[PDB]
Design a binder for this molecule. Sequence first.
Ligand SMILES: Nc1ncnc2c1ncn2[C@@H]1O[C@H](C[C@@H](N)CC[C@H](N)C(=O)O)[C@@H](O)[C@H]1O
Length: 260
Amino acid sequence: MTLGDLWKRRLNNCTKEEFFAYRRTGILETERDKARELLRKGETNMGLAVSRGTAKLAWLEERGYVNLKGEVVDLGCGRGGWSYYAASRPAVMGVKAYTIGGKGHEAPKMVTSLGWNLIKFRAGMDVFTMQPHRADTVMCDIGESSPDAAIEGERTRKVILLMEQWKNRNPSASCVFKVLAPYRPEVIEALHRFQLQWGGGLVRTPFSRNSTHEMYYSTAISGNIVNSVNVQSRKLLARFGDQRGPIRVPEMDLGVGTRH
Ligand SMILES: Nc1ncnc2c1ncn2[C@@H]1O[C@H](C[C@@H](N)CC[C@H](N)C(=O)O)[C@@H](O)[C@H]1O
C-alpha cells in the first residue's frame, strides 16, 4: 500500500463539509461566471474557455512541459477545452478531436474560438477501440473519478495502453495524457514501461483539485515516476484540514476567428 492509497481512504472518510473545503483549498480556479452563462444561453461567438481544461493545458505549454505542434489528436475531448486551446496555437496545423458523448458525458461545445475551423470534432467515438492514425501530437485527458481506487487504477491503465498504441503508430509523436490514479501498482508498472521506451515524466497542474490525484504525463519532461507520485501524495495529505480557499484567477479568452 502507498501514500496515495492512504490519501484515497482519507478522502472517502470525509464528510460532505470536509470534502467541499478540502477539494478547493489552495488551488488555482478560473473565474467562469461570464463564460458559464454565455455557454448556457448558447452563444457561439466566444473565445472564453469552454471548460476548465483549457487553462490546465495552457499552463503545461506556458511552462514548457508540452510541445503542441503539427497534426494534433485530442483523445477524449469532451466539451473541447484542449481542442480549442491547441487550435489557437500557431504551430498547430490541425486537430482531430474525438469523444464518446451520450448519456452522462459531455459533447463538444461548438464555438468560433480562434482556430475552430482547424478542428474536426467527432462525437459518438470510443477511442479505446479506434484504430490509431498519423499524428505529431497526441493528447488524452481521459480518467473519470470514482470512490473506488481500483476502478480508477484500471481506468488509468486503459489510457496508458491507448497511448502505447498511438506511440506504436507514431513513435516520434509528442504525448501528453492524464494519469488519474498514478499511485496504483499496475499504473506505476505501465508508466515505467512507457518511460523506458519513450522518455517523459509526470507533473501536477495547480488547477487540479485536491480531491483528485491526477497528474499529467508528457514526453517533454523527465523525472523519477515513483518519487514524482510520492511527492504529490504528501502534498495532498498535508492539505487535509486546510481551510483556506481557492486562488481565483481570470479565465482564458483565446479570441475568435478562423485560422488559414
Ligand atoms: N472511451 C472513451 N472514448 C471517448 N471519449 C471518452 C472515453 N472515455 C471518456 N471519454 C470522454 O473523455 C472526456 C474526458 C474529459 N476530462 C476531457 C476534458 C477536456 N480535455 C476539456 O478540456 O474540456 C469526457 O468528456 C469523457 O466523456
